[PDB]
Amino acid sequence: TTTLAFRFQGGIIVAVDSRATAGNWVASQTVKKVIEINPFLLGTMAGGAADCQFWETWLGSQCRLHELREKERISVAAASKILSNLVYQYKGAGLSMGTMICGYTRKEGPTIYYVDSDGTRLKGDIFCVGSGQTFAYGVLDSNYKWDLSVEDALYLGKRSILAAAHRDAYSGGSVNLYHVTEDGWIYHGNHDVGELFWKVKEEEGSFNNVIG
């Protein structure tokens, strides 16, 4: 698994791989690791697949109840804290999660919270979680600027997952891209890593270590 999310001028970019493994056996290459909590909020999948799926669609229900009761969009701060407070109740029982709750509201602007199954809740600009997180961080840290364009930011997220997919044995399949704006998230397609690798190699001149 490799999942990332970063804040920038145009909002938030969320990028994930698609691979699921059981030991060495590749169970799936078509896993949806971005959970669409609602049209305005996104969550990433890392650790336990069920724990992340179940509790983040549950989170979507709690967010829907909030805006029905309060007649106002829930803040990313409040949404992330509902999830972190819930998993903290289960601490010790064996839940496995590492997720980024991503949103863009009026009062906050673009906001990302890293939420963890041992109770951690961190606000931040760049987060990267999974077995291939270190590879993606390298590409992110050396190319990140606040004043990236939407086009360039989308590519940076795509390229960072590709870096992890190449080196990390347990990451790969395809790349899913999302762009989170104040008016909601926009899906930017599924990109097969096999085809993407060769395309990027030729156009970018990178991966000279690999014969093509």
Q: Which residues are known to be catalytic?
A: 1
User: Is 77 an interacting residue with respect to other proteins (CB under 8 A)?
Assistant: yes
CB atoms within 10 A of CB 69: 8
User: Is 196 an interacting residue with respect to other proteins (CB under 8 A)?
Assistant: no
Choose between 189 and 194: whose C-beta lies nearer to other proteins.
194
Selected binder of other proteins within 48, 131, 138, 184 (CB under 8 A): 48
Selected binder of other proteins within 36, 47, 57, 144 (CB under 8 A): 57
Binding residues for bortezomib: 49
Choose between 6 and 55: whose C-beta lies nearer to other proteins.
55
Is 91 strand, coil or helix?
coil
Which value, in Å, is the radius of gyration of the alpha carbons in the chain? 17
Q: Token pair for residue 100?
A: 């980024």
Residue 5 Cβ, how far from other proteins at the closest point, in Å?
20
Residues that bind other proteins (CB under 8 A): 25, 28, 30-32, 48-54, 57-58, 61, 64-65, 68-70, 75, 77-78, 81-82, 85, 93-94, 107
